[PDB]
């Protein structure tokens, strides 16, 4: 069913994150001082923003088609919350 697929996806994400964490721990620590903090932080911001921009480009909407009943339940919950929001706005 859908539950098994979602669980398995969770284990793949966990395994990938464990591997990435293991790989990331081999870098040495860098500490700053009052004289050089600003420029170093600016350079690091440039590098990290450039890194994350491509990661967001790689992202694609994943399907994982769910069953029809869960969609109905989610719609019911959404309508229920919409009711309270509407009374407040009124």
């Amino acid at each position: 069913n859908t539950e098994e697929e979602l669980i398995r996806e969770c284990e793949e994400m966990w395994k990938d994150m464990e591997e990435c964490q293991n790989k990331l721990s081999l870098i040495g620590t860098e500490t700053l001082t009052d004289s050089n903090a600003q420029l170093s932080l600016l350079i690091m911001q440039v590098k990290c923003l450039t890194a994350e921009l491509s990661q967001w480009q790689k992202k694609t909407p994943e399907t994982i088609p769910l069953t029809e009943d869960v969609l109905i339940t989610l719609g019911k919950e959404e309508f229920q919350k919409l009711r309270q929001d509407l009374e407040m706005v009124l």
Partner: protein, 330 residues
């Protein structure tokens, strides 16, 4: 009057009084509590008359804004912001909006709605004072400031929607702002047309709420009227950026395609068609029409218990949809 010695006397008295009576600033007095609120109400009621703000209030805001926690005197403090004199946006940004934005992103949803209300009133006041001047910085410089303010609040709105996980209570205020924004050229005769970003448009178009769709239809109709009016006068006065026209055209084509044209797959919603076959939709062209949109589920189910029910929708009171339908087809 606009006499100088009286202005200076009032300035000194009011600035000293506000400094001494404030709550979180200059010895942090908490005993006055109600007295300060009453004094602020009197000041607000005095500057609603005279149609402008005092110079002392601006200095008090610029001094005491960094130390404010965002809850002490929310109503009166945020009502003082609306009466800030017109000035270039770049100058007052570090003084006011950098603190307001930092307080904005980390607070509750009611604070966000409050600041959206106050910014809408500020925009209305700035526009009111600008319109009378053209009857009498250059005009090109003046419109740049208001356009930057509109873009700033659009950025605020998009990030706020992302943080709050698409709450409709916030979306009502966000659309309330653009209701005032949409009609600037007709109301105040100032040549300026600014559209809301696609993040707001496609979050309003796909909302479950029906009042959101009604308001969006009304807003689009007002944009089309204003853009039609603006183009006419240019020929006699022969400059609006053309990109506005194509952007509005894309919005309009997507909107009509989703509703009753059965062409949902526009440039904005470019979902990959072969995924839809994997998704399981047999006929997606008519999935988001008036009949089958999840927003109109209530109306469809109600009418099913009772074909040609568009009049039923109009009777239920979808006036903006009626205007948009009548003007678009003809």
């Amino acid at each position: 009057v606009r006499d100088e010695p009286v202005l200076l006397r009032f300035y000194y008295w009011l600035s000293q009084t506000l400094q001494e009576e404030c709550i979180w600033y200059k010895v942090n007095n908490y005993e006055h509590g109600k007295e300060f609120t009453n004094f602020l109400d009197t000041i607000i009621r005095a500057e609603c008359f005279l149609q402008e703000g005092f110079y002392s209030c601006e200095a008090f805001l610029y001094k005491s804004l960094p130390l404010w926690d965002g809850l002490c005197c929310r109503s009166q403090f945020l009502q003082l912001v609306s009466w800030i004199p017109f000035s270039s946006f770049s100058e007052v940004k570090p003084l006011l909006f950098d603190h307001l934005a930092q307080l904005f992103f980390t607070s509750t949803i009611y604070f966000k709605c409050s600041v959206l209300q106050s910014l809408k009133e500020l925009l209305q006041n700035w526009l009111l004072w600008l319109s009378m001047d053209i009857h009498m910085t250059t005009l090109g410089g003046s419109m740049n400031s208001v356009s930057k303010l509109i873009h700033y609040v659009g950025w605020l709105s998009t990030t706020a929607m992302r943080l709050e996980s698409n709450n409709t209570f916030l979306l009502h205020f966000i659309l309330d702002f653009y209701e005032k924004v949409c009609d600037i050229y007709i109301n105040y005769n100032l040549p300026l047309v600014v559209l809301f970003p696609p993040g707001i448009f496609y979050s309003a178009l796909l909302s479950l709420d029906t009042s959101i769709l009604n308001q969006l239809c009304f807003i689009m109709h007002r944009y089309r009227k204003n853009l039609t009016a603006a183009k006419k006068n240019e020929l006699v006065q022969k400059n609006f950026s053309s990109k506005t026209y194509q952007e509005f055209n894309h919005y309009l084509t997507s909107m009509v395609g989703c509703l009753w044209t059965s062409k949902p797959f526009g440039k904005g919603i470019y979902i990959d068609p072969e995924i839809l076959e994997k998704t399981g939709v047999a006929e997606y062209k008519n999935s988001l029409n008036v009949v089958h949109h999840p927003s109109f589920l209530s109306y469809a189910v109600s009418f099913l218990l009772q074909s040609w029910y568009l009049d039923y929708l109009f009777s239920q009171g979808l006036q903006g949809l009626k205007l948009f339908i009548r003007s678009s087809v003809h």
